[PDB]
Design a protein around this ligand. Structure first.
Ligand SMILES: OC[C@H]1O[C@H](O)[C@H](O)[C@@H](O)[C@@H]1O
Ligand SMILES: OC[C@H]1O[C@H](O)[C@H](O)[C@@H](O)[C@@H]1O
Ligand SMILES: OC[C@H]1O[C@H](O)[C@H](O)[C@@H](O)[C@@H]1O
Ligand SMILES: OC[C@H]1O[C@H](O)[C@H](O)[C@@H](O)[C@@H]1O
Ligand SMILES: [Mn+2]
Ligand SMILES: [Mn+2]
Ligand SMILES: [Mn+2]
Ligand SMILES: [Mn+2]
Ligand SMILES: [Mn+2]
Ligand SMILES: [Mn+2]
Ligand SMILES: [Mn+2]
Ligand SMILES: [Mn+2]
Ligand code: NA
Ligand code: NA
Ligand code: NA
Ligand code: NA
Ligand code: NA
Ligand code: NA
Ligand code: NA
Ligand code: NA
Lengths: 386, 386, 386, 386
């Protein structure tokens, strides 16, 4: 039961299971993992593919010979296992040069370097099959108010993304960009801190159709937001190009717990939404096996991400298929929410005395929404106690 | 010193100083205020104008004769004092009929009522001179996951705002809408929870030019976000149609403290930004005098909102005018942030070896940003210890 | 399955199911409930008892004749159903007189009134059978820094609790006090904001044995704290005299969702802890049926509180009984945590070279904790997918 | 103006200005600092002393010869500058051996090692003059619910602290312990997460008089708590043995901004409280110069910590000395808060009809607290606009 296979589209970053366990107050607890080992182990667990930052695959500062070698061993592992690479990204955050940003660094020469580093890796991503290229502007932001003029920084961010869009267009590449929001950490405040801010920004790019979001469960939860709601807004906009699945225990540092951990009911509602919307993209885990774990715990935690998705998928499907739930949804007027409010138009609404002058507000007010009964059916289904 | 006059554009909602002090665990501590008294007292304190919900000005359920009477006394007070009404809004949250929303109520008849209630008050707002009409969807959202299908709710929200835009267009009215985000309270999660989400949503309306945001200091801070940053993004988008100024002590219930209270340095950076951007709109306070206060404390707290703005304006101006600060800004490369990254374009960037192959990442990395010295000049200016 | 009976010790405040739905932005959505109706309906659902504030049972300002009448009808309902009253409390928060506090009001005459109001209700509580008397100092605190000298306020709080302890001692009453922490709301910050602060304060009372805590799930979660951990510390101290069970969706206003809602895995770990510790007190729900609900939804939500406890109890028991979990606990050294570190004492520890000079830190470091496998067994048990 | 000198008691950890800038997503941005250089630079800035973890002063794993060398160079620098060492602590968090804790590690051999490591450094601390020995249990806690039995962990924590108290007592050392709370990070939840929880725990130690708290501004703010209030409770308990001063911008990762940054008004109220209470201990900064900074920015940020304390001290003194503020305090009944509520005792209170039967609740309720006027005087003083 609940055994993943490649059909389930589960993917993992090299940096997830490969995290050595260094944290702000601690040294590594595990050795570096060879990307080849990660591809093989994830394939054996039932994954569909892996993702990478440039610098996870090729050590920063590698010579061209070393680069080619690292790429060849990785491609051979992919080819041997049938593992795919649906997404890639750039590391614009680890090296000290990026201490004030990549695309929005105050130093212009750093901004140009950030773009060149990104473009090099776009070319590699395309060759390996990535259809989405993620940008996580983790260093874009500030600890203090005058350090960053945010309007001007947004000009530089737009310029950078427009330059990347011109590049991909000129090369004829079939790849799209996905902006991954995060509200803070490692900057005191990060630019484009939520799904909303990223969606809004995209609409001022030159070629908005080339850009979407890569929301992460834990990141929206670091702002105390409802992740399923934000995903719904991204889906409504047509912009859910990729997703990062994990867990987070509230408003704190970015934990990157395995999926299912943290806010379990939000994980349930997320899976319910992805499945009923027909999301077709990768089910990507951006998680960290806690540094308490040895390598065997790394693979257990990775397996748990997939298992939890599959359990939740089963429970959500059972919830929506239950005739008692379909009745409760009617009792709560979820069907009526889908009716247009005023397809008859403004003049007909204005002339309709049943909408105002003769509307019995007290009788309407007295009608309960029946949401608690509906939610307890949902609880029962999640818990297998339906 | 720091004496407000109407030239300063300070405005207040009737419901601010008029708050009787009822909270989730407490009865009223002050009597209801007559709108006429509020207009006169605010005028004497140096305010420029007032704002209202329909139901603050005219008691809900008033007959047409009573309505006209309430409106006439208010207009006479405005006319006598020279107080203006730059903004108005609808109460789509107090009456029990709105328990599941106005525009996104699951019951269709409630959605239609919400629109009619809004349209009636738009007509009044225009007559009184409001150029901005605020929508705060405080009841739009959910406590539980299946209660609200958010994609469908967003369809209903869009339909409602598009209907209002068709109405104002057909009447030829010179008024614009401003959506006021809030992340939660009184719903467990509110739709369009931040400035970003509201900006994003606007871009999918039929007539996006008619809609902007009315961000509130405390509301973005209820998500732990940086209010000056969010205002910067709204300004960058051309969408800061109005603002609500107040204070908030962290991630908790909506406090609506007087402006300056709560996060004082964020208040400083906000004023710095509004003044350097040339924001021309009302400086509107959406605050609650704490229920500890009697009527004399109400007016003290209102006066304090204005005084704090004026003090912060002076300090921010002194900061930006100080030659030592202008040097520190250069030292921190704020000037260089404004240079285009690659106006030379993609081919020139790709051919520029100084951007990649020959870029000395370590020398760049070693250069300090000097942000702490800059921020301590800012601190010194705020504290008057420059 | 999961049918509550009085043996399960479930109790509810009159103010829970009796909440009329007034919130900071909304009028009542339900009529007032007669306490007699609440006793009868809860008894039919399988509850064991009810709790009350003075002013829930007897309207504030009732004459002595009216008081006696309200008490008699309630006692007759209790007597008819076999419902108990294990806890009572005072309302020191609704009336405007308490706007700056009860026991720590700056006005001395208010502090004295608060004590008299409390003592009157202690006498009633004892007659009705309450063994715990809760104090929730919801108005004790401040919105601003100089309004409340906290050291002096703590002196007044101690004086009040010591006076109450002298009263109960002199009357020979068998009742204990339980302080209910909350971090904020309705005050900007509330004194004794967490379980820890309340436990600490108790140790400086004259008769500390008479005082414990009444922690509430949602209140500790309003500080982002781990409720099971705080309960563990209260149990460790011998101070878990009562508990309030509910749900909360993060760091925000006090939601008082039904138990099980909000942080579901924290609800699981809480039940696991209460059951393995042998907590014998009431399983009391301090919740609000959302104001979306009519009366039928009130009773559904109340029933859901009890059902969720019972489901979680079953899952937690199954988890701890599973041989695979008992093995995983050993693999993770939970057994070894219970061994004394150094029962051999300080001189033997200092002379033990295996504790320092000859301790192989790297071999110890390399041993994984196996916590992820353990936690995934816990997840599987919660979800019924063991 | 605002020039620190040793008389001001300012101290800094070696790890503060010595932070190399590694964060969870970034490599070091600055070179390691020699402790000798730190002592000399801080002395030149006007500091009084420095603090250390064992492993900041002596590299982990140093041979006895290397240890003695590191200690000698440091003592020579101290001796040359007149810099003191008022506090020391153990690093029980960086090495991978401590991945599940020191004193509460599930592995018993790790717990014993943690104690030996601590005892070795106590002996050094005493020699160097430390009068306070801090314990920060940053690894004590869990990411998952079954990983740590908190009651049993508290038994192990108590055992460890009792063993340390027996050791210091047997050696005759004049040193006290201070527990530094933090709610989370690097563990998902940390044991003893707040000042309150630590104060409570101390009262169950064998020799409670030997233990107090070392609260940190940012740590209490990571739980959204009021730091001045928590300090007031620690002072009220007689347990403020040391303090860590810094800044924090809300509920997020531990930022360790320079003091004054983050919540500026809380910094003001903190200084007001420390000065009026007569706190005599070190004014210790536990801060991180942001990794954006080079070495010159390190010393600017360190200097800014001290400058901000001194500015705030001046403003707080001016506030309390202002006759207008002393009148406002009376208007707000801060004087009356200091009067005993019922020194006349319980029988006299019960017989006093002015406390209940004849108390005019409405007249009392109608009296405003005048807190807003008081707080605006405080604002004016902070801003130098009095
Ligand atoms: O962009 C891919 C990844 O970059 C970094 O690893 C971020 O920490 C992570 O959240 C993001 O998903
Ligand atoms: O929309 C105007 C106002 O409506 C309500 O009063 C909200 O509480 C407030 O935040 C909003 O600004
Ligand atoms: O003290 C009993 C109750 O008083 C109030 O109703 C509080 O809101 C609640 O949290 C508390 O449990
Ligand atoms: O215990 C002294 C220090 O140990 C670590 O450096 C912690 O991060 C810090 O908060 C604490 O004060
Ligand atoms: Mn993350
Ligand atoms: Mn991610
Ligand atoms: Mn507000
Ligand atoms: Mn507002
Ligand atoms: Mn509550
Ligand atoms: Mn409660
Ligand atoms: Mn810290
Ligand atoms: Mn610290
Ligand atoms: Na590689
Ligand atoms: Na573009
Ligand atoms: Na009126
Ligand atoms: Na439109
Ligand atoms: Na009654
Ligand atoms: Na006592
Ligand atoms: Na050294
Ligand atoms: Na002891």
């Amino acid at each position: 039961s609940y055994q993943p296979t490649p059909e389930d589209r589960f993917t993992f970053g090299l940096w997830t299971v490969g995290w050595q366990g260094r944290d702000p107050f601690g040294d590594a607890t595990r050795p570096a993992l060879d990307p080849v080992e990660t591809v093989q182990r994830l394939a054996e667990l039932g994954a569909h593919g892996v993702t990478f930052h440039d610098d996870d695959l090729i050590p920063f500062g590698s010579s061209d010979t070393e680069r080619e070698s690292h790429i060849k061993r990785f491609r051979q592992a992919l080819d041997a296992t049938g593992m795919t690479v649906p997404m890639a990204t750039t590391n614009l955050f680890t090296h000290p040069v990026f201490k004030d940003g990549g695309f929005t660094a105050n130093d212009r020469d750093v901004r140009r370097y950030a773009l060149r580093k990104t473009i090099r890796n776009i070319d590699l991503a395309v060759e390996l099959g990535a259809k989405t290229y993620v940008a996580w502007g983790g260093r874009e932001g500030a600890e203090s108010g005058a350090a960053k003029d945010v309007r001007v920084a947004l000009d530089r961010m737009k310029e950078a993304f427009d330059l990347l869009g011109e590049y991909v267009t000129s090369q004829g590449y079939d790849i799209r960009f996905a902006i991954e929001p995060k509200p803070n950490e490692p900057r005191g405040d990060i630019l484009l801190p939520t799904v909303g801010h990223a969606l809004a920004f995209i609409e001022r790019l030159e070629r908005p159709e080339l850009y979407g979001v890569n929301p992460e469960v834990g990141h929206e939860q670091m702002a105390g937001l409802n992740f399923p709601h934000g995903i719904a807004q991204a889906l409504w906009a047509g912009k859910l190009f990729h997703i990062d699945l994990n867990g987070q225990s509230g408003i704190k540092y970015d934990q990157d717990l395995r999926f299912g951990a943290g806010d379990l009911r939000a994980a349930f509602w997320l899976v319910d939404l992805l499945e009923s919307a027909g999301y077709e993209g990768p089910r990507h885990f951006d998680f960290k096996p806690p540094r308490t774990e040895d390598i065997d715990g790394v693979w257990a935690s990775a397996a748990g991400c997939m298992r939890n998705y599959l359990i939740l998928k089963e429970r959500a499907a059972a919830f929506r298929a239950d005739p008692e739930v379909q009745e409760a949804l009617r009792a709560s007027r979820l069907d009526e929410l889908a009716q247009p409010t005023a397809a008859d138009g403004v003049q007909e609404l204005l002339a309709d005395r049943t909408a105002f002058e003769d509307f019995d507000v007290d009788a309407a007010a007295a009608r309960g929404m029946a949401f608690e009964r509906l939610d307890q059916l949902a609880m029962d289904h999640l818990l297998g106690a339906r």
